[PDB]
Design a protein around this ligand. Structure first.
Ligand SMILES: O=C(c1csnn1)N1CCOCC1
Length: 291
């Protein structure tokens, strides 16, 4: 799977909100482009003169994420974040020249990402009461990953002493994206656990935080809520469910070639962090069948 790389695998089965610190600093921003940010402004002007209803939005930028020594007390993860925008994404990661910008960043800064917007995504491994994960089908008419399978998620918009409010917005945003697209009541969802961070090498290395969320509704009840919104209540074109039993071997299935990179990252981290038991009971052959 060359189109996804793991940047972070969380310990303890995943981290709760209270164990994460954020540092939001202009030191974590994209570097100005070598020949100037006028190249971004030109791409944006061309796009608005074809689609004048488009609008810019702020985004968080991922610089890096440092895990504490395993088994330690106190905060377990430090997220170093800057600020970026949808406009800067279109002019860098989404540009035909994105690979040239990665090479220039290695040369100038020793950092393949230094010239890339790198907006932070969120995604969820969303489990039902009857032990299935939730999958969504993308429209065949959108620009990114048309017709592919995704999981619930999105790219959160901004608004440890500004830090804790940023971590709160990240955790809040993955629940809001589940309520907006799957049409589930907020009170049927668990507090999220962070499983890790995955990079999309098809989008010049932009990263997504991948979370585990449990729902108190069955697969049948989740399906009814999604469909009862009607076609205008969701961007996806369909919902479907895979038993958690079967997610273990998903990379060996024909479904794997249909998954978009950020959804592949969610399922790899689910299998490594929530699956893959370490104890004698769940690791016994009848409960963890060999192969
Ligand atoms: O929020 C984002 C986004 C992706 S990368 N940074 N921003 N979207 C949603 C709307 O359609 C375009 C992509």
């Amino acid at each position: 799977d060359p189109e996804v790389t793991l940047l972070l695998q969380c310990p303890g089965g995943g981290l709760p909100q209270e164990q994460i610190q954020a540092e939001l600093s202009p030191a974590h921003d994209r570097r100005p482009l070598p020949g100037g940010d006028e190249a971004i402004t030109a791409i944006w002007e061309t796009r608005l003169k074809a689609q004048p209803w488009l609008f810019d939005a702020p985004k968080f930028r991922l610089h890096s994420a440092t895990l504490a020594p395993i088994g330690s007390r106190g905060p377990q993860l430090l997220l170093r974040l800057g600020l970026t925008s949808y406009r800067d994404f279109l002019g860098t990661n989404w540009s035909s020249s994105a690979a040239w910008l990665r090479q220039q960043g290695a040369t100038d800064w020793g950092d393949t990402q230094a010239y890339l917007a790198d907006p932070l995504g969120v995604g969820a491994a969303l489990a039902t009461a009857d032990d299935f994960l939730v999958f969504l089908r993308r429209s065949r008419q959108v620009a990114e990953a048309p017709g592919l399978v995704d999981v619930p998620g999105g790219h959160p918009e901004p608004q440890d002493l500004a830090g804790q409010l940023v971590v709160h917005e990240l955790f809040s945003s993955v629940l809001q994206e589940i309520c907006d697209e799957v049409n589930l009541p907020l009170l049927t969802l668990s507090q999220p656990l962070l499983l890790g961070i995955a990079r999309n090498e098809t989008s010049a290395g932009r990263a997504s935080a991948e979370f585990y969320v449990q729902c108190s509704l069955t697969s049948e009840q989740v399906r009814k809520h999604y469909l009862s919104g009607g076609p205008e209540a969701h961007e996806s074109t369909g919902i479907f469910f895979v038993e958690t039993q079967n997610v273990r071997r998903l990379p060996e299935t024909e479904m794997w070639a249909e998954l978009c990179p950020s959804a592949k990252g969610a399922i790899i981290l689910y299998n490594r962090v929530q699956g893959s038991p370490t104890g004698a009971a769940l690791g016994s052959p009848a409960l963890l069948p060999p192969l």
